[PDB]
Structure formats: C-alpha cells, structure tokens
Symmetry: D2
Subunit: 425 residues, 4 copies
Amino acid sequence: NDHLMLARQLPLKSVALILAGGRGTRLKDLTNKRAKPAVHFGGKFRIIDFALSNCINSGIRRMGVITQYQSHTLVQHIQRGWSFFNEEMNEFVDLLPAQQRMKGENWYRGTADAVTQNLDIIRRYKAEYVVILAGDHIYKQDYSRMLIDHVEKGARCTVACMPVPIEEASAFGVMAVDENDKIIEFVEKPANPPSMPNDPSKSLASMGIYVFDADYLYELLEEDDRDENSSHDFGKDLIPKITEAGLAYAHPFPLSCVQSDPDAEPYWRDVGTLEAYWKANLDLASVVPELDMYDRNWPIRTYNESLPPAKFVQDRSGSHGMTLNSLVSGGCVISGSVVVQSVLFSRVRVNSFCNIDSAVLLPEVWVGRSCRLRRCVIDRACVIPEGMVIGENAEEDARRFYRSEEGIVLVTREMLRKLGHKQER
Amino acid sequence: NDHLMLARQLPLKSVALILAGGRGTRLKDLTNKRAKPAVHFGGKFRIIDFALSNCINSGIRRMGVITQYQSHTLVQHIQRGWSFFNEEMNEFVDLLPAQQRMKGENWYRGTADAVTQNLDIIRRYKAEYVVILAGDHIYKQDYSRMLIDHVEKGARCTVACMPVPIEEASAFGVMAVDENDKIIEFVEKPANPPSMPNDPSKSLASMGIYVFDADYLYELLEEDDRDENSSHDFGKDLIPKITEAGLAYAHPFPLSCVQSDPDAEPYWRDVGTLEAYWKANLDLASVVPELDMYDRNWPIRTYNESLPPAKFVQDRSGSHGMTLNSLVSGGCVISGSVVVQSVLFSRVRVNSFCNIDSAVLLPEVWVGRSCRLRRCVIDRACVIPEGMVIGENAEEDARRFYRSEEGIVLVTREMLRKLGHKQER
Amino acid sequence: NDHLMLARQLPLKSVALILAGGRGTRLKDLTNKRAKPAVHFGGKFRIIDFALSNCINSGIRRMGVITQYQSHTLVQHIQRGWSFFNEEMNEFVDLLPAQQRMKGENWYRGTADAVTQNLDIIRRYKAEYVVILAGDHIYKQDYSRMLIDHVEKGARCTVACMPVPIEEASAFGVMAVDENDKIIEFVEKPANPPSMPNDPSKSLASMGIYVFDADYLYELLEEDDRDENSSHDFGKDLIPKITEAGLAYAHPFPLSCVQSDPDAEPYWRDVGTLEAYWKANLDLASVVPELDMYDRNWPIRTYNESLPPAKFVQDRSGSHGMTLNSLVSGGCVISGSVVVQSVLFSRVRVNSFCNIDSAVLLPEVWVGRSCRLRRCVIDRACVIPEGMVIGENAEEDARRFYRSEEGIVLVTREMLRKLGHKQER
Amino acid sequence: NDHLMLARQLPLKSVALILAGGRGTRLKDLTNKRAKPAVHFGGKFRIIDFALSNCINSGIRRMGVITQYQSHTLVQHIQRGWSFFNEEMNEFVDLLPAQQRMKGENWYRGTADAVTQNLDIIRRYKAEYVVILAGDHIYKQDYSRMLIDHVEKGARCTVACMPVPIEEASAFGVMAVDENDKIIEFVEKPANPPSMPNDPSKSLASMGIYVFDADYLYELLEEDDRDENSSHDFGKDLIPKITEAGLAYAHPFPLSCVQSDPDAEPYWRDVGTLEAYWKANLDLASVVPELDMYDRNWPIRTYNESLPPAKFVQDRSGSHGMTLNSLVSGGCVISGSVVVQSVLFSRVRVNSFCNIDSAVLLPEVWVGRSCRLRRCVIDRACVIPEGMVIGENAEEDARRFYRSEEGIVLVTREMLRKLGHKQER
Ligand SMILES: Nc1ncnc2c1ncn2[C@@H]1O[C@H](COP(=O)(O)O)[C@@H](O)[C@H]1O
Ligand SMILES: Nc1ncnc2c1ncn2[C@@H]1O[C@H](COP(=O)(O)O)[C@@H](O)[C@H]1O
Ligand SMILES: Nc1ncnc2c1ncn2[C@@H]1O[C@H](COP(=O)(O)O)[C@@H](O)[C@H]1O
Ligand SMILES: Nc1ncnc2c1ncn2[C@@H]1O[C@H](COP(=O)(O)O)[C@@H](O)[C@H]1O
C-alpha cells in the first residue's frame, strides 16, 4: 500500500501516547519526589523531552502524556516548555492523570489500564494510528519511518525491536521473529532471556514502542479490561495476545534511528539503575559523545529557561579555575576550583578550593569551600557543607549516603539533613 | 504604615492560591464530569477565569491553583489559556493537584489540608501576603485595594465580607464586626444566620477571600494539621481560631469592587444551585447586564479559541431566522430558527424550525429539526434529536431529565442516551 | 527520483518567500493605508493568512515575508498571530522589509529585486527548494505535492499554472506547455492572451507560485541584478529567461489543491478589483460556500483575538432583529435591525432600525440609527451617521463616495470626513 | 495630588515610546549592519532589553518601539523575545517604522518627527502619561517612581536628570534647576558644559527620559511640526520650548534607580564610543559587578534562546583549559585554551592553544588554533583564521583592523575578508 504522499499524511492521522506513568524503583531516591520521565538529564533536559521531540520532528503533533506518580514537576515542565501549541492547527499535549472523584478511586491499575480509563477522550481525537511510547527512555527515533513500515506490511501492531546483550535482556520484552518480521514468540521479562539465532550473546528486545491500528487497540483493551486474571500491561498481557493471533510485526530500530554518524550503532539508554544514569550524562561530557545534541536536523525541545551566562571567577586567593571535559550550563558560578568529567546543571554555585571529578550536579546545588567530590550524583538543591569529602572512603560513604554496588554515590537533602546539615540556603 | 509606592510593591510580594478544589454538589449533573470552577459561563468563559483575571489586573501574577475533583478539563483549560507566563519575570500559574504515590494516598482531607500538603512548595515562592481565593465564584475584584486595607490596619488575616439576604446566609460564613472592622463573632454555615445591626433582613457574610500574613498562615496550619478533632477547613476551623485571638479584620467588598456604574451594587454570584447558574448567564443576554464584559479597564482572560464567525443561514424553506436579546458565540450555525433570551456557546449547530427561549446551550450542542426548548440548560455535546419538546410539560420533563423545583430543566448525554437517543454525531 | 520518505523531507529542506510586497492599485482606497495582503477577509482573516497557513499545513515552517508598502498593520498582524514559533525547531516567520540607512536608499526596485537585497539572509537558511509565493491571493494549496512533482520531473523551476477565462487572462502570466508539462512559450501580461489548445475560451495562467532550485535562483538573480535593461520582476524578466533555456516546468493546481468536494473546481480569487473583493466575502455567507472554512483538515491560522460573543438586542421599540445568510463575528452588537447577505467583522455596532443588504462591514464600524445599506463596502472604523442612505441612488453615491462601474460602493473615513461627518467615536 | 492607589493606576494610564531610532556614529563599525539598541551586551542581551524590561517591571506594558536605521535584527529580536503579549489585557509592543509609500517618502526627519508621523496611532492608545525613552542606553530604572514625582509636582514635562563629569557633559543635555526641581536653563549639547552649583567638576545632564502629559505632547509637536526652522528633536527644539514657559521639572535618577547595594552610586552607561562598550561588558566579568544581573527583583527579559550547555573539552594534546573572571554563555565550545577577563556570547567555538585576554567575543565567532587575543572586540560570526595575533603590535593592528585611540581593537568580517581570509564557515 505505497503512495507518493503517504509518508506525510500518516503522522497527521496519528496520535502518540506517552506512558510517563510510574517510576523506576531501580533509580533509588533519584525518584522519591518525581517521576522517572522528569529526571534531569543532559545539563538542561528531562527524559520526557526525548519521547516528545521525536513526535514533533516526526510530524506527530498530537501527544497524550499519561502521568500517575509524583507528577507535579513533570506537569509543571510540560506547562512551561510544551505549551506553545494551538489546538486549532490539530496539535496539543494533553495531560491525562487519573480522574479523581469520591476521594479514593480511579488510580490506574496497569500500563494498559491507563489507556482504558482515558478511552473516551482518545476516541474524540479520531486517530487511525496510535503510537504507544514509553517516555522514560532516551533515544532519537523517527516515528514517520516506523509508521510506514507498519503500513507497507499491512500490520495491526508493530513493535520496535532492537538487540541487546543477553545479560540485560531479563528486564525487557524478548521476542523471536521470522523472515518477514512477524513475531512468533513473545515473552515479557523472562528469567532466561532466549538468544537470537546466529547471535548467541544477544537477544531481540522490545523497546516499549508499539504502533497500533486504532480500530484494533480499542477492541483489544475493552476485550482485555473485562479480564479478571489480566495484570493490565502492554507487555505482560496484550502483546502476547496479538502475537498468538499472528497480527504482530517487528520494526527494527536501526532503520528509524536518527544518528549523525551512520557508521555507529543506534543509541538506546533506558537509564535503568543509578549507574547508567551517571554514565549516560558524562557521555555528553566526553570529546566524542555517543549522543549528538549539537544536531540541528533533529533538535530536542525543552524548557528554555532564562539564565545568565556561566560565570567563572577567581577564588579567595586570586587563583584560576581549571576545567577538563565538562559541561557548565547557565546560571552556574564556579569560584576558581577544578572541575573534571563533570556535568553541572543550571544555577550550580561552586565556592572556592573544590575538587569535582566524574560528578553530576543537578540544579541549584551549592558546593561549599574545600569540598572533594568523586563519582557522585548530587540531587536537586543539595547544600553541601564546607570540607565535605565524597568518593574517597567507600566504607564512610555507604553509611552516610547511598552507594551502589559499582561505586556511584548519591546525595540528597534528606541524606544530608539527617547528618545535621542545614539545607535551607 | 502608608508609603507613596506601597500600592505597587505588595502584589509583587504576594501570592494567590485558588481553591478550585472540590465541586458544588448543588449543581447536580452539571458537574459530574468536571469541577465547578470549569463550569462554562458567559458564552466563552469558565468560572475560574474570574478568580484569575482579578489576580492579573491586580498585579498578582503568581497564582496557585489547587485542583482535586475531575480536573482534566480545568487543567487543560489552564494549559491552553493561562500558560503565556515566563517564570523569569516572577510570574506563573502553578497547578497543585495532590501528589500520588503507593497508589491510594494523599487525597486532600479539607480546604486547609490542601494548602498544607503543598506547604513545601509555597515556602519556596517567598511570599509575605497569601491571598486565599475560592475560585468557584463570579466577581470583579481588585485585590490590590484589599491588600492595602490589610496593611493599613496592621492585620494578620483579612476576610472580605459583603452583606447578603438572611434567607441565603445559611450557606456562607456569617460574622459580626465593630467600628474598626474587627471580627468579633464568626460562625460558619449557621442554621439561624444572625442578622446585621440596623439591617434585620441581611447578614454580613464571608466570600471565601482571605488575605493572610504568610508568617501567620504557615504557623497556623502546622498548628492545625496536628489537631485530631479539626475538620481541616478555612471557615470551619481556622477563621474561628484567628477570630478568637482578635487578629481578624473585615474588608468590605464594595470598596475593592470594580464596576462601571458606581450607582450600582456590587455583583456577586456563586452560582450555587442550578437555577442561579441559568439566571446568571441570561443576565448577560439582557439589554443592561449587571455584569459588564465589554469593559476594557478590567478585561477577563480566557482560552481565545479559534472559531469562525457566527453563521446564520436560511432554513429548508428559504425563510429568515429571528433573534431577541441573545448571545451567539463563534462557530455557531443557526439555520433560520427563532432564538430568544438565550446564550449559545461555541460550535452550537441549530437546524431548521427550532424554537429556543430562555435556554443556555453549552458547547458543541446539536439541536435537530423542529425542536422546542424553553427554560433549559443543554449540557456539552448533547445531540438533541428531531422533534424533541422541552419545557412545556413539567410532568413529562421531570421523568425524562432533571427538573429543579423552580422549573429549570437540565439535559445531559447520559439523560438522552438512556431514552435510546444516539449521541455520537 | 522517487523514495519512500521523500514527501516529508523536502518541506524541511525548503523555505517559502511571501511577496507581501506592493499593493493592488485596482483595490482603490481599500488599500491607501495598508498592504493588499493585510486587507481583511472572511470576518476574521487577512489575505496573508492564506499564503501562510498553506506553508504550515504543507510542513514548510520557514517563511520569509517581504513587506514594502504600508506594512504597519501587516507587521503587527504577523507579530500577534504568527509569532508562536521557536527558532530552535527550525521554524520562523522572518520579516524582510528593505533595510534603511543614510535616510533615502534601499527601496526594492522590483518583485525579484526584493529577494536580491535579502540574498545574504536567505543563504543562511541553507535551503534547497525556495517556494516563491505571491501572498496577496486566496487559495488552499498543498505545497508538499507541488514540491514532489518538482522533484520527480527533475525540474529547476516549477510554475503553478491553472486555466482562467481569456477575458481576465490579460492580468496574469499566460504560458503554453507540452505533453511533459514543459513551458514552451511564456509571456507576461499580454494584450491578447493566447488561448489553450482545444479550449479556445480559456488561457493557461501563472498563479505567481514558483518553486525554485535554490542553487539556480541565487545564480539567476545575481546574473539578473547586473542587467541594466531588466525591470527586476519574476514574471517580466526571469521566468522568460528560464523558459528560453527549457528548464521551466508547469505544475497543475488541481493536483495540489485542497478541497472538501472533489467534484468541484479549484478555488482561486486574487481579489483583483473592488467588485471581486465584495463578491468573494459574501460567498462565505451563502448556504454552500465555494470556500470551506469549517474544514479541520486544512485550517487557517490567524490572529485569534479575544472578543465577547455576538450580542443581538432589542431595538428602542422592543422589537426583534432578523438575519438571513449572514456572518456575525465576535464583538458585534446588533440592536434589532435587518441584516441580509452581509458579513460583519469584529466589533461592528449596529444601532436600531437599520437595513443592511449585501454589505461587508469591516471592523469597528458604527452604523447609526435608521440607516439603509445596499451593495457597499464599509471600511475600518467608519462612523456612519444617523439616517444615511447608501446604494439606492447611484447618481448620489458616486459624487459622495466611490462607486465602481458594477455598482459596488466603498465608504471610508476620509470620504465621510469630507462631507462634515465627525469620525471620532 | 497624593491618593492611596495612585502608584498602581498611573502605569496603566501610561504608554512608553522607545526611540530605538538611529545609530551611534561613534560605535564605528559595530553598528554598520544594525541599530545601536540591537548591539549585543552581557553575554545574551541586547541594549533594548534594558529600556523594555524597566517598562514591564514598572507596570508599563504598552510600549512603542520607533525603529528607522538597520532594524532587521532589532525587529526580529522583538518578534522572538517580546511577543508574549496579549492585546486584550491592554499590553503590546508595537513596532512603528516609518510608513513607506510611492517608494521614497516618510523617512523620520528628527527624534520628535518620528513621534509625529505616528501621532494617529498613539492617540488610539488613549494614554494620559507618555514616557519618552531613549533605548540605546543601559540602566535599571523604575518609571512608576518617576511618574508619581511627576504627578505630585503637578508637572507637564519631567526630565530625568543625573550628574556626570563635566568632561563628558558635552554629549548630553545640560540643565540647571532650582529648590523645587524646576528647570531654569536648558541647553542641548553645549561646547562648554556649565557646571553644577557647589560641584564645579560635574554637570546636571539629561538622560533622554522625558515623561509628558499627553494632552501637552500632542499640542507641542503639532505646534512644532509646522515650524520651518526647527530641527525636529526633543533636546534641540522642544525641551527648551517647555523650559522657557516654566512647565518643565527635573526628576533625579538616584530616587527611581533600582540597585541592590544602596551604598553605591546609580549605574548609567550609554556605551557611547567603542571603549565604553568593551569596558561595560567586562564589568560583568569582574568579581563584584557594578551591574547586578543575578537580581530576581528586577529581572531583564530577553530572547531566551535554546542552547546546549557550555562545553569545555581537552585540546589536541590532552591538556586542561584555564579560566579567570570570565563569562561563557551557552553553545560555546572551548577546546582547552586560556580565557581571561573575557565575555563569550552564544555559540563561540574556541579551538586549541588560544590565549584570550580582556576580549569580547560576540556570537558565532570561531577562533582558530594558536590565536592570541588581547583587548579586542570580535564581531558577529567572525571566522578568525589559524595563528592570528591581535593586541600585541598596535602599529600592525591599526592598519589591518580598526583600533581606537585608547587601544581597543575591533574585528569584523569585512576587515578579515579584505585580508583574504574566507569567512564562510
Ligand atoms: N530549590 C529547591 N529546594 C528544595 N526543593 C526543591 C527546589 N526546587 C525544586 N524542589 C523540589 O525537589 C523535588 C524534585 O523536583 P525536580 O528536581 O524539579 O524534579 C520536588 O519536590 C520539588 O518541589
Ligand atoms: N464533543 C464531546 N463529546 C462528548 N464529550 C465531550 C466532548 N467534549 C468534551 N467532552 C467531555 O465532556 C466532559 C466535560 O468537559 P467540559 O465540558 O469541557 O468541562 C468531559 O468528560 C469531556 O471529556
Ligand atoms: N479604530 C480605528 N480608528 C481609526 N483608524 C484605525 C482604527 N483601527 C485601525 N486604524 C487604522 O486604519 C488603517 C488600516 O488598518 P487595518 O484596517 O488594521 O489594516 C491604519 O492606518 C490603522 O492605523
Ligand atoms: N552567522 C552569521 N554569519 C554572517 N552574518 C550574520 C550571521 N548571523 C547574523 N548575521 C548578520 O550580521 C548582521 C548583524 O546581526 P546581529 O549581530 O544579529 O545584529 C546582520 O546583517 C545579520 O544578518
């Protein structure tokens, strides 16, 4: 079903649904006061700016952001950086938190029980192709090249699949395909992830990116919402049901990936645990980042906050401040200290004589005089006191703060407030 | 404490808090799928555009909209018509729905238990004067003339009071004042509303508009949040506590009312029941409205939706359509029918041979051919079928639809869908 | 050169250039204080909302509006209704008025000498396909179906051509094509428009819509800007030069026309004279308009001004107001008068006892008591006095106001101010 | 005439008029392709963001920006950073370039002949107090404390005056006042600036900030526009005329100045010559700036451009980059070089082995490998080639580029393009 203009008409006949939804329990306390899509990233972004700017640059300007857990920061972010739309041009970012009445009802029992509470609003959009996006993930995808591959194949559901190492394939949806990219066997979060054919060390995993014939989705959820043994989830209940009827195809991600270096492999990081969050940000600080953010053909839209330039000033002794492979966003004030392999977000104040190495300083952090920081994640608005040392004694950082098994430290206000340090600057 | 520039500095040192909050159980099914602040009004407004445009024109550009019950329409309305702000100029409309975690917690136990869940966010605003607005009400108030009268008197709390007939004074907060506008006796929602001195037929009632010294509010809620017998409400728990310490003054509303005819009385309608909602809209349709909306010195900001002009066309027989004291907003298409004392909102389609009298047609209503409508409220998207008659047989309109004691009919999709009529045009 | 995704990539590689430019000397005094693209139309639109909303809905979000003559209203309109863009997403509406220095230089000698003054700014956009739009015209075109037909054919320039009656073909660019849609003979504004083959009563006319290979445009203007005998115009100088090299193809407009009734003919009105301006607006007032503006698949974006609903009130005698095939936009206040086949724009006040027939009342017009209006165009802010009669005595309307040869009257403030009538309400 | 609420009503009854207007011929080639109000400043600002954010924070939300010379950048900047207004709330930034018709007329003969061409538009605003702002100047003023001092005194015109050294008082309007702040003697740009009484080394100078009774301004310009010997300027023609009638008062700037350190003197820099432009930017780079831009009670609004964080990377040799009292805005990429006392604007790329000292690098500058820069101003988009040396040989920098008498160098593309260096990266 190939036509000259089909590539431009299908995004307009389409509607995206971001399951901002729940959290990552594996992100520890990075999330205790926010949703995982609203975790900061990149010096100025949040994670949901990746699953939203790919809808825009793919022509999909009708989005539906499903928010349940700690969404105040998320909703405020959509309000301030994603509310430039005009509903008359057939474009909008509708927020669909669970509707509360009688004071204790409607709380979204599953991933697919959140698209069923809102199934009277989504019909009104009159959409033929429903993209189902997990927006707690980081990528650069073109969903107007996955929609075609969906329309050429004559598919009803189209799961974006990409291979990953079998070691981490127990956290995603492993499938198995054929010569025509038809899903034969799908199993969600196995304990023994089956390998690919010819690639024993890797498994063909679902990314959480389903494209759906809308006439099939509505008839599949209402045919699923009445099920008493269902767990109400896309992976755990529906995609096996579609697969077992043979109506589920697989769309390889390398085809519909936007990357500035065609020789490279596609970039996917779901920032699962704490360690991959830290490792994902500092990749932007290296010399050749795996993720291009100086790209003008696929830009990422965010809250363009008004901040003054990054100021570097002399310390108390009149000396210089040295920097090496670091990002200093706007608002920062670094008073003559050494910053290495670091990422400083907005409004980070760093007083004199500090040493900062492989750190990520989320916004409004105040580092006090003579602090040493190594392999850490400093949370929002943390007021680090004077002479604090972090990342040199693992036995003394595990009983103060949180310390992952790989050596990454996390600092929060509650962790610092419990040691007596006042966090009200 | 009078200074030359005090009238301009206090709104900037101020923060408004709209308790969009719960519903009006007395509005019947007008509200079953929306909050009372999001009830439509005026052809193009919602009720919360009144409690928000008075903050803007009073200089208060920092608002806090507390939303709990059926807020999807409300939040979408704030997003599309109240998201032109820039957070750098010290201005914003923050939405503060209850934060949900663990799937069944944090549901706002009272009016004053919603400003206590959010008391870690409001401290961050660093506001000295907290205006506490009930935003389910209709008025034109200047809160930079109530803030001064609060600062001149040296008050800690300042309740906007206005007299109302003793008949309807059992639904508001009746107080009693002295020569210096100090509250002596406050009682919330009495069964026998005490009268005023010298005006036995009227009672001095609270409007739900408290101005607070912020250093006193925070210390009053935390001193109240620990109370086990409290009901967590401003009227029912706190304002008596302030009153009994003698720190509560009364600010007359006629002083800080914006009205284009100084000879008139101040305009306050809380659209309590169904009958006062209908009566309040048609007041705009009369020749001399009590509420001026063609006023340019105190304009009301709303979702400026892009709609085509109001089209009037000839009916099936080539005849004319007559109109008398009516409002026809944009999008409407009236095919040669008689419309009298009516208010038609956006996108109301009225086919031929209809007769419409003292009606209010909320948006996207479709009236079919040969319909007669008298003293009714047609809800959103109601698809009235052909030959329907409403408002001529009270015994036949009470057992089909809802009919108030005063004779006002209300029509909803669920009422029409239950009689077999398909509402999917 | 056909590829799966070519239909979506070419608008993003493209840049549109609207020649808002000069005026229509044939519009008489409708234009004396504005550019022809800023002439009002449709109850709420201006003409340049047609040549701009077709770029948006065609994916072309980089526009260049070239303005020279009386552009204050035009520029203010772009500012208030076309400034929702974010320059980071590769989208903008750049205004390119002639750059003034030394107080009397740089005044745009021709249509193609306005794209040559600005040829240092347009290179910076890095565009491969330059659409050249005359934006003083009314249509609904999809320029992402003309760009392909340009890329399939391997063309360098692609002129959108559509047939018109030979009677009015002396005002457009008549061409002649072959079996492959190659322009053979082009002549601009002939005195004897050549006819089509097989259609002696019609001529194949240029619409003023050129698509250009950018590498060819820049090399064609700089190769033309040095010409001393050139008149610096697209039609009169360049398109013959391209044609005579055989690099100019013709793109039929019926292919790339957006119309809701496929059985109909394409809609093109350049509102040439006064009579076609009046006739073009009232077409929207008829029962079946030739131009669909209740279309949601190709909406027109404009200045969504905040106006109250259209109010109809009783006259001084308590009587009704009748309407027949008319458009009443927002702000209007019609006090019980008869309005027929009319178009009332925003904020038109019509006092009692008026009779209005086949009129067009541009905004902020005040009609006084007992006025009769027939076949007229009332300009902006005209304060028609009491008892004025228009359109019943042609000999008495030609020596007061302007009256076309076909019987259309035009009323301006200067025409009314010269008869003594004060126009300062 | 003192009333409780007068401080808040007068800005709303007011209208500001920024004379963005002509250029500074003394800024040399900084301006050759832009107006002086659009000169960059501060890392991210332009100069007209100072004369506009003081209207906003002073409550004056109706501005009129008069633009004549090279306004493409200025108008584009107003469009993208000052077009968040809604005309219904009585707020706007109207652009008033001279209206062009017949191709060579209407070119604004003087400063006060630009408010007379536009005197039919300004009457429509219905403003009582017209602030007349020169917007090519840098300050932090509160015009709602100058308007009162104007209304208390019962003045007709109110000139903001502040003392400056008699050495530079030949470029401003020197006046002389009395005990009641009444102007006695005004003379514009004298050759021998008269001194103050008791301060022989300083002169009481006009800042170009006139507040006017609107009923007097309109009657003063029309009474001046007919004068054949007038030069059509506020200083040179009108203010002497008002002064000689005794209707002109003087408003001291230290009263209505917003400064975070009350012990300091008011900040006024008109960035007259090249040397004061350079000296004015680096003041922001010092440790204690004279101009506070980290102030939240009087923020400056600008084009909040979306730029990535400031990246510092290692040079070709793996080494560190050192910084000392510098501002690095967003977009910059500094590859391991030394930056001192500098100001880098957006998108400045600095390759390896550079040395940059007391420089100002306007946006999109590319510094090549092994460059030494000292006491310079690098203009927009300058592509400095490899091994260039600037600021070490004054005899070799005066015959290449422009070099002021005080030692400041200025680098432009035309200066670099004339030495053969290609500026097309
Ligand atoms: N300056 C601050 N100090 C303390 N908490 C903050 C600050 N800014 C934001 N927060 C809170 O930090 C939590 C996470 O917000 P965010 O980091 O924006 O996702 C929320 O509870 C915010 O209200
Ligand atoms: N065209 C429509 N048809 C049916 N329901 C609608 C329509 N538009 C809005 N609604 C719903 O009507 C309820 C009230 O919305 P509102 O009238 O906008 O407050 C909500 O549940 C909306 O989703
Ligand atoms: N209410 C009004 N009264 C008189 N002239 C106006 C009014 N509104 C706009 N204009 C002027 O009418 C001319 C045409 O403006 P427009 O009709 O908006 O293109 C311009 O000179 C405007 O400044
Ligand atoms: N990247 C660039 N390269 C060359 N010229 C530019 C660039 N950006 C802006 N300009 C021009 O530089 C002049 C000054 O612009 P601005 O610096 O923005 O005031 C104008 O003629 C602009 O069009």
